[PDB]
Design an enzyme around this catalytic site. Structure first.
Site, mmCIF file in Angstrom:
data_model
loop_
_atom_site.group_PDB
_atom_site.id
_atom_site.type_symbol
_atom_site.label_atom_id
_atom_site.label_comp_id
_atom_site.label_asym_id
_atom_site.label_seq_id
_atom_site.Cartn_x
_atom_site.Cartn_y
_atom_site.Cartn_z
ATOM 1 N N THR A 18 -110.596 -70.305 -16.844
ATOM 2 C CA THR A 18 -109.993 -69.590 -18.311
ATOM 3 C C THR A 18 -111.099 -69.226 -19.095
ATOM 4 O O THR A 18 -110.833 -68.340 -20.065
ATOM 5 C CB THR A 18 -109.030 -70.465 -19.016
ATOM 6 N N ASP A 58 -83.540 -56.007 40.469
ATOM 7 C CA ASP A 58 -84.329 -54.990 40.689
ATOM 8 C C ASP A 58 -85.471 -55.095 39.437
ATOM 9 O O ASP A 58 -86.270 -53.908 39.133
ATOM 10 C CB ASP A 58 -83.716 -53.632 40.611
ATOM 11 N N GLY A 59 -85.938 -56.192 38.897
ATOM 12 C CA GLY A 59 -87.007 -56.528 38.083
ATOM 13 C C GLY A 59 -86.519 -56.090 36.586
ATOM 14 O O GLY A 59 -87.310 -56.181 35.611
ATOM 15 N N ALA A 78 -84.580 -68.301 41.470
ATOM 16 C CA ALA A 78 -84.994 -67.283 40.843
ATOM 17 C C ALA A 78 -86.482 -67.605 40.336
ATOM 18 O O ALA A 78 -86.497 -68.624 39.823
ATOM 19 C CB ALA A 78 -84.331 -66.556 39.826
ATOM 20 N N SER A 114 -75.895 -60.220 36.164
ATOM 21 C CA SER A 114 -75.819 -60.412 34.790
ATOM 22 C C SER A 114 -74.383 -59.822 34.297
ATOM 23 O O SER A 114 -73.849 -58.978 34.827
ATOM 24 C CB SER A 114 -76.841 -59.906 34.011
ATOM 25 N N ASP A 134 -81.893 -61.724 19.710
ATOM 26 C CA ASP A 134 -80.569 -61.097 19.723
ATOM 27 C C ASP A 134 -80.061 -61.004 21.075
ATOM 28 O O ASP A 134 -80.382 -61.033 22.147
ATOM 29 C CB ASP A 134 -81.400 -59.478 19.776
ATOM 30 N N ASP A 147 -82.992 -65.782 28.742
ATOM 31 C CA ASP A 147 -84.314 -64.883 27.673
ATOM 32 C C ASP A 147 -85.377 -64.902 28.525
ATOM 33 O O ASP A 147 -86.168 -65.713 28.970
ATOM 34 C CB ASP A 147 -84.703 -65.866 26.415
#
Ligand SMILES: Cc1ccc(C(=O)Nc2ccc(CN3CCN(C)CC3)c(C(F)(F)F)c2)cc1C#Cc1cnc2[nH]ncc2c1
Lengths: 92, 920
Positions: free
Chosen positions: B13, B387-388, B404, B451, B491, B514
Site C-alpha cells: 500500500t 463403418d468407423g 468391439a 446404434s 451431450d 462415449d
C-alpha cells in the site's frame, strides 16, 4: 371407522368416517328430519364438511328434504357455503 | 471504469498512493494483493500486462543490476522513494498510457450495491424497463466489478466481499455462503491451506531400490496455489487406514501401499521436483496410478500447459544410485517388449511392471486385464463396427462371443477412459470387458442391432410404442445414474444409444456409449443441460425421425406422430429455458416410470363451460349429450381431428344415447333419450333424416341396442331394430317393471338390467325371469348407499352393479341371487362415489377423477389413476373412453392393454433394478 351414532343416523356429534360423513350428514342424507333436529339441538356443526366438501345442508337439499333445510337454516347454518366443486346447497 | 491490481512481492500500500479502494488516474478500482509488478520469482506465477517498478530503491548500480537480473514485463521505472518520488510522475504517465491502450446493468449496479448486510431483481424491475429482458439480461451479470458477488449452489439467491475471506487472522444464510465460498476459494478444505511450510519428519518405509517406484516431476516454476489444490484432490484415493500427514502428502494405507507425494530441490538444481514414492507390489502400483492420474488431471484442468519433465527412477542392482529415465523411453520400451535391458553388457534386465507400473496398464482390476490368448483382437481395417462412425472400433471375439475393439494410438487418453469406466456399472451403461494392454486398446460388449441413431434413421417400422418407452426409460436411467455419481455427460445424442435387443419385454434394450452441436442447451456444463439434452433425445424418440433427419414445435403436430400425452409435457418441462425450472434427471425418470404414460393414447379438452352427461361410440367418433342448459344439445366429437361440433336437437336435456345398427340395409340410427321423455332418432349419416318414436310417460334414462328403452318409471319398452327407423314407432311389448323407480341399467349376457333397487333378467321372450332385491345388502353398506338408484350393471359370471352417489360397488351371483369399496382403494393409494363402471378387468370411475382398476379373479387393485369421472366405456385397437369434469369437460382415451402393460413395467423395472443390484 363409524360410531353407533352413524348407524342410528342411517337407520360424538362431529366425529367423521372414511367418507367424512358425521351422524348429521347421514341424518340429512337418509331423510330422518327428527334426527337432524335432535342433532342440531344437541350441538351439531351445521358448517361441517366431508371429504367432498358437502355440508349437512348440501345433503338435505340434495334429495329434496326441504324441512331439514329449514331446520338447519333456523339453527345457524350457512346457506351459501361451498363444496369441493364450489356448489352451494342453493345450487343443489 | 477499469480494474487495477498490485502484484509482486514490497511497498504494497505504500506505493499504491502514487483490500479494495477507488482511485482516479478515468477512475479505476485498485486491489492490493493494468497490473503493477513491484520488484524476483513470484512474478512468474502471476503470468494482463505487468509493469516493473522498483521497491522505492532509496536505500544506483545495484538497482540496475537487480532490474537486469530478471528483465534481461512491459517497462521498468525507478520510483526510488516511499513518497514524492522523482519518477512517480513518469510511472503515473506510463500507467495511464497502458490503461488507455451490460451498460444498463453497470448503471443499475449503483442502486444494486445498497445492501447493508434475490429481491434485487425487483429493484431491477421497479426502476427500469429494459431489464424486463430478465432471462436474457441476467445470464452472467456484478462479479466483474468486485461488488455483489453471486457449481456454487448458494449463488442464485445470495449477494464481507473479500476481506473476510479474516479467517486467516485466527446470519445463518450468510455463514453458509461464507463456508461455501471458503471451500470454493480454497482457503479452507473439507478434510486449512496455510498449515505449515516445513516438511515434517516422515516414517521409515522400505528403502530397497527394487522395492520402490520413484516418479519425479521436474517443473521449472511452481504455479500459485498448486500445492493447496493438490492437497485438496489427493484425498479421493483408494487401493480397493489413511494415516495422512499434511504439509505444503504422506498418504499411507498399509506397509505395502503408500504415496510419498512431496516436493523438494537439490542443491545443484534451479528447478523444483515433485517426488512420488510408492511400493512396487500389487497394491501400491494402483496408488501410483491414481496419484499420477490426479496430478495429470490437476495439470490439465486447473493449470493447463506447464517444460514439465516426468522421470522414473530405476536401479539394476540394489545399493547403486538411482538412474532416471524419461517416461517416453519407458513407454517405447513397453510398446516394444516387457523388459528394459542394459545397453552395456545386455545380460541384466528388469520388467517394466517393476519400474513404471502405469505404462503397461499394470494393476488393473482382477477381472479386467486382457488375456492375450482368448481374445481375437483382430483390428484389421475395413472390419469395422458401424463403418468407423463409432471411432476406431472393429469387431473381434473375446471368449467365443463377439465384441468391439477400440485401438488407442497417447497413453493418457486410455488411462483416463479406463478410470472413468471402472466406476460406472449400470444396466444402461456399456460395461467394460477387456483392458487391452499390449495392442493398447479397449474391448467392450457388442450391440447386434447397431446404434439407436441408425434405427431412427432407417428402421422405423419395427420401433413400436413400447419399444420407444423402453429405450427412453433405459437412457433416462443411465443419465440419472451418471448424475448420481456427480458425472456430467457432454451431450446425449441418439448416436450414443446402442440397441441390443428389439424384444420389448427384455430387461435391457438401450445403452449409452462415449467413443472419445444441435443437442445443446441454451446456456452452453451442468446437469440441467443434460436434462435439456435428454428432452431433445426423447423428442427424437417420440418423433422417430425428428430433428436428426431435418423453441421446438409440438412433436405431435409438426411431424404427425401418434399422440403421446404425459411425454410431450415431460419434453416441454425438460426443454425449459430457465435451468432452475428443468426437472432433475431423477424426476424425469420418475415421470417416465409411469404406468399411465404408455397407455394414455389421447386426452381431449372440450370447450369451456360445457357439461356432458352421456356418450356413445360409433363403430372413430363419439356422440355426446350436452347438459349445461335446459336444451337438448347433441355433440359430435371426432377422435381423429378433434373436431368438436354441437347442435340443439331437443327441447329438454338429453339423458341417454344409443346406436341401433341394421346390417340388413346398412343403417345406423342414434337414439337420444331426453328428460321430457322423447326418443329422438337421428340417422348417423345425416342429421336431417330424424324422427321420434312413441313418447314415454317419463324421462328416458337408459338405452341399449340388441332397441331397449328404459324410462324413469321402469317401463322397459322393447323396440325391434328394424322398427327404429319407423316414425312414431310403438314398442311391441313393455315390461312395466317398477313404479314411479327408474330403469337405468341394461346389459347383455338372456340379458339383465337394473331399476331402482331391483335387478331383473329376461330372455328373448321378453318377460321377467329373475327378480333380485338389492336392499337386502344393507348390513355391508348403510342405507344411505344401498337405497339409492342403480346406475351401472356389468356381467361376466356375477353381476357387478353400481348405485348412484355410492362409493361401494356390489357383486351379485347370477344363480343364488346374492363388495368393492372405492374409498379404501383411494385412501391406501377425492370424492370416492362411484360414477361409472366398465368391463373387459373391472374399471371403476369415481366422482373425484380417479379410475380404479381391478382384476376379475381376486378384485385386486392394480392402479388408482381432470378431477371428475362422468362415464367410461369401451371403443375401437380396443381402447377405453372416460369422460369427466374440471366446468371444463375432459375426455381420456386409454389403451385397453392398460391392466396388462402396467403390470409388465412393474416387473420390468424390477428385474432391471436387479441387474444394478448385481452390478453395484
Ligand atoms: C469399444 C468401446 C469403447 C468405449 C466405449 C465407451 O463409451 N466408454 C465410456 C467411457 C466413459 C463414459 C462416461 N463418461 C463420463 C463423462 N464423460 C464426459 C462422458 C462419458 C461412458 C458412458 F457410457 F457412461 F457415458 C462410456 C464404448 C465402446 C463401444 C461400443 C459398441 C458396442 N456395440 C455396438 N454395435 N454397433 C456398434 C457398437 C459399438
Amino acid at each position: 371407522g363409524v360410531t353407533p351414532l352413524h348407524l342410528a343416523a342411517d337407520s360424538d356429534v362431529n366425529a367423521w368416517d372414511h367418507y367424512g360423513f358425521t351422524p348429521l350428514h347421514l341424518a340429512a342424507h337418509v331423510g330422518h328430519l327428527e334426527i337432524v333436529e335432535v342433532l342440531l339441538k344437541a350441538g351439531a356443526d351445521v358448517n361441517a364438511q366431508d371429504h367432498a366438501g358437502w355440508t349437512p345442508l348440501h345433503l338435505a337439499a340434495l334429495y329434496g328434504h326441504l324441512e331439514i333445510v329449514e331446520v338447519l337454516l333456523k339453527h345457524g347454518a350457512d346457506v351459501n357455503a361451498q363444496d369441493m366443486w364450489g356448489e352451494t346447497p342453493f345450487d343443489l | 471504469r477499469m480494474k487495477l491490481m498490485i502484484v509482486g512481492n514490497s511497498g504494497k500500500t505504500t506505493l499504491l498512493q502514487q483490500d479494495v479502494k477507488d482511485w482516479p488516474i478515468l477512475v479505476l478500482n485498485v486491489w492490493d494483493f493494468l497490473y503493477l509488478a513491484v520488484y524476483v520469482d513470484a512474478m512468474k506465477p502471476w503470468l494482463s500486462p505487468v509493469i516493473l517498478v522498483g521497491t522505492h530503491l532509496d536505500v544506483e548500480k545495484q538497482r540496475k543490476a537487480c532490474m537486469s537480473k530478471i528483465t534481461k514485463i512491459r517497462d521498468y521505472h525507478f520510483v526510488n522513494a516511499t513518497e514524492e518520488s522523482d519518477a512517480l510522475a513518469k510511472l503515473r504517465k506510463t500507467i495511464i498510457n497502458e490503461s488507455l491502450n451490460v451498460e444498463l446493468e453497470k448503471i443499475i449496479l449503483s442502486e444494486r450495491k445498497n445492501v447493508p448486510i434475490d429481491r434485487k431483481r425487483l429493484l431491477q424491475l421497479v426502476r427500469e424497463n429494459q431489464l424486463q429482458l430478465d432471462e436474457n439480461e441476467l445470464p452472467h451479470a456484478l462479479n466483474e466489478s468486485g461488488v455483489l458477488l453471486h457449481a456454487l449452489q448458494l449463488s442464485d439467491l445470495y449477494f464481507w466481499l473479500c476481506k473476510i475471506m479474516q479467517i486467516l487472522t485466527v446470519p445463518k444464510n450468510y455463514m453458509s455462503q461464507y463456508f461455501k465460498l471458503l471451500e470454493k476459494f480454497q482457503i479452507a478444505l473439507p478434510i486449512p491451506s496455510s498449515l505449515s511450510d516445513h516438511r515434517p519428519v516422515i516414517e521409515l518405509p522400505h528403502c530397497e531400490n527394487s522395492e520402490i517406484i520413484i516418479r519425479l516431476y521436474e517443473m521449472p516454476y511452481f504455479p500459485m496455489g498448486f500445492w493447496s489444490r493438490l492437497i485438496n484432490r489427493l484425498l479421493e484415493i483408494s487401493p480397493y487406514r489413511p494415516n495422512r500427514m499434511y504439509w505444503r502428502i504422506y498418504l499411507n494405507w498399509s506397509p505395502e501401499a503408500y504415496c510419498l507425494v512431496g516436493s523438494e530441490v537439490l542443491d545443484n538444481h534451479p528447478e523444483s521436483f515433485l517426488k512420488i514414492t510408492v511400493p512396487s507390489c500389487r497394491k501400491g502400483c494402483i496408488l501410483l496410478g491414481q496419484v499420477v492420474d490426479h496430478i495429470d488431471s490437476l495439470m490439465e484442468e486447473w493449470f493447463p500447459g506447464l517444460l514439465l519433465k516426468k522421470w522414473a527412477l530405476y536401479s539394476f542392482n540394489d545399493g547403486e544410485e538411482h538412474q532416471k529415465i524419461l517416461l517416453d523411453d519407458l513407454m517405447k520400451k513397453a510398446e516394444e517388449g516387457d523388459l528394459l535391458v542394459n545397453p552395456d553388457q545386455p545380460r541384466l534386465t528388469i520388467p517394466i511392471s517393476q519400474i513404471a507400473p502405469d505404462l503397461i496398464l499394470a494393476d488393473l482390476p482382477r477381472n479386467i486385464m486382457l488375456n492375450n490368448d482368448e481374445l481375437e483382437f483382430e483390428q484389421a481395417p475395413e472390419f469395422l463396427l458401424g463403418d468407423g462412425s463409432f471411432g476406431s472400433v472393429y469387431r473381434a471375439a473375446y471368449e467365443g462371443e463377439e465384441v468391439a475393439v477400440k485401438i488407442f494410438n497417447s497413453l493418457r487418453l486410455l488411462r483416463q477412459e479406463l478410470v472413468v469406466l471402472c466406476h460406472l456399472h449400470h444396466p444402461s451403461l456399456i460395461s467394460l470387458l477387456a483392458a487391452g494392454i499390449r495392442p493398447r486398446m479397449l474391448v467392450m460388449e457388442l450391440a447386434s442391432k447397431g446404434s439407436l441413431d441408425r434405427l431412427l434413421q432407417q428402421d422405423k417400422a419395427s420401433l413400436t410404442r413400447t419399444l420407444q418407452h423402453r429405450i427412453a426409460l433405459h437412457v433416462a436411467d443411465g443419465l440419472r445414474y451418471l448424475h448420481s455419481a456427480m458425472i456430467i455427460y457432454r451431450d446425449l445424442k441418439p448416436h450414443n444409444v446402442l440397441l441390443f435387443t428389439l424384444y420389448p419385454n427384455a430387461a435391457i434394450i438401450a445403452k449409452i456409449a462415449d467413443y472419445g452441436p444441435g443437442f445443446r442447451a441454451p446456456e452452453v456444463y451442468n446437469q440441467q443441460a443434460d436434462v435439456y439434452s435428454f428432452g431433445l433425445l426423447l423428442y427424437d424418440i417420440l418423433t422417430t425421425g425428428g430433428r436428426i433427419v431435418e423453441k421446438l414445435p409440438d412433436p405431435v403436430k409438426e411431424y404427425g406422430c401418434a399422440p403421446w400425452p404425459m411425454v410431450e409435457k415431460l419434453i416441454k418441462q425438460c426443454l425449459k429455458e430457465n435451468p432452475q425450472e428443468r426437472p432433475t434427471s431423477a424426476q424425469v425418470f420418475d415421470i417416465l416410470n409411469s404406468a399411465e404414460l404408455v397407455c394414455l393414447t389421447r386426452r381431449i379438452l372440450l370447450p369451456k363451460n360445457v357439461i356432458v352427461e352421456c356418450m356413445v361410440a360409433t363403430h372413430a367418433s363419439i356422440w355426446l349429450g350436452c347438459g349445461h342448459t335446459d336444451r337438448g344439445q347433441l355433440s359430435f366429437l371426432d377422435l381423429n381431428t378433434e373436431g368438436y361440433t354441437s347442435e340443439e336437437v331437443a327441447d329438454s336435456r338429453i339423458l341417454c344415447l344409443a346406436l341401433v345398427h341394421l346390417p340388413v340395409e346398412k343403417e345406423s340410427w342414434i337414439v337420444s333419450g331426453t328428460q321430457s321423455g322423447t326418443l329422438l332418432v337421428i340417422n348417423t349419416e345425416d342429421g336431417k333424416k330424424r324422427h321420434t318414436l312413441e313418447k314415454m310417460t317419463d324421462s328416458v334414462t337408459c338405452l341399449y341396442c340388441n332397441l331397449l328403452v328404459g324410462t324413469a318409471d321402469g317401463k322397459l319398452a322393447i323396440f325391434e331394430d328394424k322398427t327404429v327407423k319407423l316414425k312414431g314407432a310403438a314398442p311391441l311389448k313393455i315390461l312395466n317393471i317398477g313404479n314411479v323407480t327408474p330403469l337405468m341399467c341394461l346389459s347383455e349376457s338372456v340379458m339383465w338390467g337394473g331399476c331402482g333397487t331391483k335387478i331383473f333378467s329376461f330372455s328373448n321372450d321378453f318377460t321377467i325371469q329373475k327378480l333380485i332385491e338389492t336392499r337386502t345388502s344393507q348390513l355391508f353398506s348403510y342405507a344411505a348407499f344401498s337405497d339409492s338408484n342403480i346406475i351401472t350393471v356389468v356381467v361376466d359370471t356375477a353381476l357387478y352393479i353400481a348405485k348412484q352417489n355410492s362409493p361401494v360397488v356390489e357383486v351379485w351371483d347370477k344363480k343364488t341371487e346374492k363388495l368393492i369399496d372405492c374409498v379404501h382403494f383411494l385412501r391406501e393409494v377425492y370424492s370416492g362415489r362411484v360414477k361409472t363402471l366398465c368391463l373387459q378387468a373391472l374399471w371403476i370411475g369415481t366422482g373425484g377423477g380417479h379410475i380404479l382398476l381391478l382384476d376379475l379373479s381376486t378384485r385386486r387393485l392394480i392402479r388408482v389413476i381432470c378431477n371428475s369421472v362422468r362415464v367410461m366405456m369401451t371403443a375401437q385397437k380396443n381402447v377405453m373412453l372416460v369422460l369427466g369434469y374440471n366446468i371444463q369437460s375432459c375426455l381420456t382415451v386409454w389403451d385397453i392393454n392398460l391392466p396388462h402393460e402396467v403390470q409388465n413395467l412393474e416387473k420390468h423395472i424390477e428385474v432391471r433394478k436387479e441387474l444394478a443390484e448385481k452390478m453395484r
